[PDB]
Amino acid sequence: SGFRKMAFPSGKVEGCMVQVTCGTTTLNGLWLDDVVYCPRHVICTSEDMLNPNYEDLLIRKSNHNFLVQAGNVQLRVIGHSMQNCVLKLKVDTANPKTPKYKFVRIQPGQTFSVLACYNGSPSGVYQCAMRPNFTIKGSFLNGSCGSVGFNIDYDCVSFCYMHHMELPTGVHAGTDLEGNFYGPFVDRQTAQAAGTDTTITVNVLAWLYAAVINGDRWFLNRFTTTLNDFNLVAMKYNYEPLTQDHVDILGPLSAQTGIAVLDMCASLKELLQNGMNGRTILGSALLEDEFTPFDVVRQCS
């Protein structure tokens, strides 16, 4: 029992983190096999940041302009290419600690672990979700660029996020490991702003099912709802629409607890209306939306 925001064990990723330097700029890179992945903005200077022409900046670099340091060892860069907003530096050593891995692009609502790193050395690990507005609410300082997000279902690391920037509201934007941004963001210092964020409904429902599994029923009620009436109310509280896909996905949790999905939807409606009146659910006084249905099944039982 208990229920915690739990990250994946970080060791498989720690063994891949390196430091990448170009000129005066240092950030983190991910070393897999004989390739180091990092944000392409490592090649930008001070005056570059508003309207960088990355193709023009990159053609002026040779391999030996990139310093890559793995612990105490310098790696030799023997090739470079850009893919979307990531730089791929070919190096002369395959990383002997390369795990089984894959690159996956995730959808809003998906969770992952972040290994926050500075100067190629890991600082801490925490759990994040991809928000509906394609940002993440991370914890990142200057130097954290190139830190990665991942899942490890089984022994295989799924890399899903690389950190590039902080937006003015203090939330964070980045790419997949093929260098495509999440959301409408770009790697320029022009004014851009996160859209209004919304609550991840399916995850709140998952977490309510977690609370029932762990022995808490106070928030249930005798009512049900249609999917459409649920969505009409939930949108008034800045909750994302719940789709039939989401209802399907909650099927296992429903079967475990004996509480139909639309019955749980009725519970959520009432919680939005009433608040918690001094009670907590799994130790929180707010509804939590950063546990997925998959996460709940993994952690509970």
Next chain:
Amino acid sequence: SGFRKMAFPSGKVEGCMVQVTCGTTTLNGLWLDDVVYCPRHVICTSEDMLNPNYEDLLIRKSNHNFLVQAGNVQLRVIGHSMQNCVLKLKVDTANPKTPKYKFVRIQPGQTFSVLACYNGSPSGVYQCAMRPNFTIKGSFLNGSCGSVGFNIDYDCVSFCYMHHMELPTGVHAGTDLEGNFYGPFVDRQTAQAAGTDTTITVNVLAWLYAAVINGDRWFLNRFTTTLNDFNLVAMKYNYEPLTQDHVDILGPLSAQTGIAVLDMCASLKELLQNGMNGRTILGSALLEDEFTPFDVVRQCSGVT
């Protein structure tokens, strides 16, 4: 920017986790140098656990009754002994992945990272605090015994917790790595309960400083207080007393934000008396007490 409950990177400890099997019981062990540490309760059946005589149970076992698996490799147990509530299995191979480490015993209020493990395989990492009532609010299922807690102070892993049991309220109890329980608990199946808990005041203040550093300032006010008056309020709200030592420890954060500790205590006083009036702090509607002052400085400075 941002502030998150953050665990230490777990790699150095992952390379020490093994599976220990005795009869039909499987749980986790910690392999350092040539010794595997695990809960002594691994030698018990259910009926033994009712009222175990550990000395007597252990003398009936040979080395080969302990099956130890490191990944897919069997280790050979060549000795066994007990220290308090931990079993020490001497094995024939030193762990080549042994980090620099120490065994330390932590104080209530201090935080640490837990690597939750099952069948010798790490499953998840999260941050916990040792509660004033000497429990931790962990997340552990059957099979998690022998999972450990740690801090990393440089390149040195300080191991401070080994998991032994779940209490009826769904909180968790365990030992240091020398096998001494935190709290008034025993390793036997008899009725035991968590004592009434209190809030860790110095940590709440730390987290208020974190909030200010991250731009959340609504709760600041023009008032200050003294230690004695504040402590009268804490007691009423089941907060731990604040000591001068605590004030000293928060000194850095005070100087950086321009908010004296007793000025922040006046903020906290008001929050306890009036609540949050619909507002949040760092996204929470509750006052958080599982970040130490060190935790806040570390995350709001960037140490690796």
